[PDB]
């Protein structure tokens, strides 16, 4: 029933197109490019239904009164103008990660959204995966996991030379946050989720961040601190074999997932779990190796995403949880970027 | 065949006596304690053979001349004394990790081993696991794994109440490097190992280290920078559930170890591997997920350690690198998480 337009014919749109009408309370009703040509091409390539209204401009798609909500895979640096213009037409927004170039810009967006009573949500797929509920459940269990001590997350991939010269992620004027915004993002969200959405008190990047000639981050890392003795580390890179880890350790347990951003298969999600582990009397064996658990997921996680995204009929307020999680993730992103610019200085989040 | 003396009746000597036992080119010959009281009970308790020279001092055992080498499981802070003193009696030392309370001290022990022409080697067991070769080998494959970018390592376990009150690992005067010396050591070692034995250039501790009231580290972490885009992180704790990971990320592959200090079973060791990968076209799945390799270890790693030590007539070098990294880390915490240059 909920009608979605696609603002921008980027590559990530194909996967989300499929999510939109694996639906099943949401549907593709419009697509827009800067070029009618390309929007035309995109719609047929991706088998969009005949009734899909096909726009040759962003402005034009915003203006179409038979679209409830937009999906916006636009470069990061377009978000502040175009998410705002869209809020302003009563479009609800599914905004791609990272949400903006900084938290000031993202506060504008959210304001516009509140102002118009629309829902905003960000592109983060993995948090809607049923596994994620199981992850949060384990981390909340005071006997299987206990009190949290550390969480370590990372995501890296090896961009080919074409990617390193050409992709929007290496360009300061589009996706200008680089590996931090594109991959660090996810490592930050996992550490925030593990920590019951509590912000850290301080952030400090690791020496040795790689920038490209244009000053844009190819790889970097950080520790976060809650001054509790809970801490976390993030790591991300454009220059190293695909790897995507969560490792989280508490007083009574340990949690591992190795495919946390994109599962191995869409059909399943597995995570590994270990509680009060130890050695036999002689330390020649562990008494019990970690347990592996796997969950059937009939509906892919991105489909769960639009699903939950898809008030207009019952008159509720928007759910502030989403923009709120998004602001927190973007704040850590800026602390990290600002610790590097300031030469690896400890950044207070007060 | 090689005649070994246990200087000190440590609970860890119980698994090393078995190491020695099973090591075919070595034999358990002497064992001292500070009281021949417990020396006799340790020897009985641990099924010692008849001919085992039971001594009631460290000195008693340093003069026995039918002993070529000593395993030394003494608290960290006794190393500097008893290790200079075993070498002047011209005995070869299997020294327990951490090697000493700082690198100054360990250089003093190494000198005295050279001066007297003897072999020193710390008791890091795991680097003698057979797994550890095909793995140095997997990380040397500039095609299956490529150029190294980062390596993450940690070790944590959960001290109960007694441990945190009574263990020698929380006493400043005893094993006073705490978690860094007892657990960080292993992570640091994996980090040097993976990087082909090269000191990083700087070391910086993560804010939020936990110290006890005596000022002993119960948890802490750090990053190491080699300044060419290679970095590493290490983490260790006495306050969190058992966890032992190595993760190394190269240009073309990734290696993962989840046991590593102490495998799950002594009779085998596993690790996970992945090279190029990759999603399908719709990023809807992984094109080849990582894969599991197991290796049969007919002989446990502590036993392979003793065998190797039983060399007769590098290790001090690697010991020093890791001790050095330990002190860098510690100096960083004490100087408020400042970066610390390793010359």
From Swiss-Prot, chain A:
UniProt EC number: 1.-.-.-
Keyword rRNA-binding in record: no
Enzyme class: oxidoreductase
Superkingdom to which the source organism belongs: Eukaryota
UniProt key word Acetylation: yes
GO cellular component: cytosol
GO molecular function: nucleotide binding; oxidoreductase activity
Pfam families associated with the record: GFO_IDH_MocA (PF01408), GFO_IDH_MocA_C3 (PF22725)
Keywords: Acetylation, Oxidoreductase
Subunit structure comment from the entry: Homodimer.
Family: Belongs to the Gfo/Idh/MocA family.
Protein name in UniProt: Uncharacterized oxidoreductase At4g09670
């Amino acid at each position: 029933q909920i009608r979605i337009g696609v603002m921008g014919c980027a590559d990530i749109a194909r996967k989300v197109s499929r999510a939109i009408h694996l639906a099943p309370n949401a549907t593709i009703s419009g697509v827009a490019s800067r070029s009618l040509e390309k929007a035309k091409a995109f719609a047929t390539a991706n088998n969009y239904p005949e009734s899909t209204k096909i726009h040759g401009s962003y402005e034009s798609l915003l203006e179409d009164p038979e679209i409830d909500a937009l999906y916006v895979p636009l470069p990061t640096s377009l978000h502040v103008e175009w998410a705002i213009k869209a809020a302003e037409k009563g479009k609800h927004i599914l905004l791609e990660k990272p949400v903006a170039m900084n938290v000031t810009e993202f506060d504008k967006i959210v304001d516009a959204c509140e102002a118009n009573g629309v829902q905003i949500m960000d592109g983060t797929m993995w948090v809607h995966n049923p596994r994620t509920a199981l992850l949060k459940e384990f981390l909340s269990d005071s006997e299987r996991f206990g009190q949290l001590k550390t969480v370590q997350s990372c995501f890296s991939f090896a961009g080919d030379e074409d990617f390193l010269k050409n992709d929007i992620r290496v360009k300061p004027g589009l996706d200008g946050l680089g590996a931090l915004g594109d991959a660090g993002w996810y490592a930050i969200r996992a550490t925030l989720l593990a920590n019951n959405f509590e912000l850290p008190k301080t952030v400090t990047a690791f020496p040795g961040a790689v920038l490209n000639e244009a000053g844009v981050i190819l790889s970097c890392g950080a520790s976060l601190s809650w001054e509790d003795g809970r801490t976390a580390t993030i790591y991300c890179s454009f220059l190293a074999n695909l790897t995507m880890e969560i490792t989280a350790i508490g007083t009574k347990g340990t949690l591992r997932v190795h495919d946390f951003i994109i599962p191995y298969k869409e059909t399943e999600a597995s995570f590994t779990t270990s509680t009060k582990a130890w050695f036999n009397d002689l330390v020649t064996a562990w008494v019990s190796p970690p347990s592996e658990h796997t969950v059937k997921t009939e509906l892919p996680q991105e489909a769960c995403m639009v699903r939950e995204f898809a008030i207009k009929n019952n008159g509720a307020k928007p759910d502030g949880y989403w923009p709120s999680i998004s602001r927190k993730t973007q704040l850590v992103v800026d602390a990290v970027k600002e610790s590097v610019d300031k030469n690896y200085q400890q950044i207070s989040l007060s």
